[PDB]
Amino acid sequence: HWGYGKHNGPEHWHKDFPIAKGERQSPVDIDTHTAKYDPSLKPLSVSYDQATSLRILNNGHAFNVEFDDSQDKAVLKGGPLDGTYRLIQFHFHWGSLDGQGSEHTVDKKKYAAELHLVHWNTKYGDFGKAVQQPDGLAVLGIFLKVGSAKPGLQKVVDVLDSIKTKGKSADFTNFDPRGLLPESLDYWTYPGSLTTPPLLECVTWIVLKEPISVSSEQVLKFRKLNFNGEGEPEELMVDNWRPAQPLKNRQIKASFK
Numbered sequence: 001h002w003g004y005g006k007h008n009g010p011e012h013w014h015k016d017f018p019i020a021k022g023e024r025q026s027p028v029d030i031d032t033h034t035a036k037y038d039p040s041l042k043p044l045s046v047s048y049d050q051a052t053s054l055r056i057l058n059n060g061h062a063f064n065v066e067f068d069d070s071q072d073k074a075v076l077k078g079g080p081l082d083g084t085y086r087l088i089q090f091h092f093h094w095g096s097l098d099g100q101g102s103e104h105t106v107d108k109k110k111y112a113a114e115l116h117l118v119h120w121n122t123k124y125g126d127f128g129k130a131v132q133q134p135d136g137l138a139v140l141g142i143f144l145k146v147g148s149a150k151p152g153l154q155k156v157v158d159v160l161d162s163i164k165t166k167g168k169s170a171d172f173t174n175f176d177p178r179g180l181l182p183e184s185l186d187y188w189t190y191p192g193s194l195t196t197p198p199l200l201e202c203v204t205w206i207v208l209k210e211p212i213s214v215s216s217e218q219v220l221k222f223r224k225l226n227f228n229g230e231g232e233p234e235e236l237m238v239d240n241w242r243p244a245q246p247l248k249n250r251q252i253k254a255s256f257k
């Protein structure tokens with residue numbers, strides 16, 4: 001089964017998921033000098049005040065904080081998007097060392113981690129249908145650098161002990177994802193894919209320019225998670241990131257000058 005090891009990592013994925021070598025794969029390097037300001041891009045609208053978090057799950061690849069997406073409670077609109085995209089889950093990708101971990105890079109710079117807030121287009125009715133469409137998902141990507149702690153992350157950090165291993169979940173209600181955002185909503189955007197198998201080319205990527213800061217202690221706790229299930233040999237959940245893929249026939253647009 002696919003993963004992030006030497007024998008099942010990103011360089012192997014194409015054998016089971018041939019779209020890995022497709023025309024709009026993610027992540028990518030964001031060359032800041034080549035991205036073009038697009039004045040026709042509208043401000044992002046992040047409407048999370050009514051978000052209902054439910055649960056946190058270690059799925060063997062990352063941990064997902066899941067939300068109630070049966071109504072328009074936490075939605076992303078505007079920017080490059082047509083229509084309304086409902087928040088279903090967020091998760092992170094991170095490194096074994098502070099110098100790597102992000103999936104997108106910025107002028108080849110790797111951040112310590114990257115947060116993905118995953119949303120699906122309500123015109124397709126459910127998430128499983130949305131991933132089959134070229135405009136099915138909108139993923140809001142936020143870089144993490146190590147410095148000061150992010151207070152709004154701590155409730156996530158402190159539950160990780162209870163979901164150490166693959167398949168474990170815990171109740172995770174009343175978590176406010178607004179506490180994970182940076183100050184500015186300036187962003188880059190481009191058409192891409194899921195960054196894990198099945199690698200479907202269904203994502204409008206919206207990557208914020210401003211990183212959030214998290215503390216060394218916070219990221220160290222991410223690195224205590226396990227890829228393995230309970231009672232299996234311990235393999236630390238680290239370096240669960242796909243490297244940058246060829247941009248091919250795509251333009252990255254900037255919301256800002």
Ligand SMILES: CNC(=O)Nc1ccc(S(N)(=O)=O)cc1
Nearest residue numbers: 116118139193194195196197203
């Ligand atoms: C239930 N399946 C599911 O959520 N798959 C999924 C979602 C998002 C991403 S990412 N890394 O591109 O944001 C990858 C896989």
Ligand SMILES: [Zn+2]
Nearest residue numbers: 091093116195
């Ligand atoms: Zn992701």
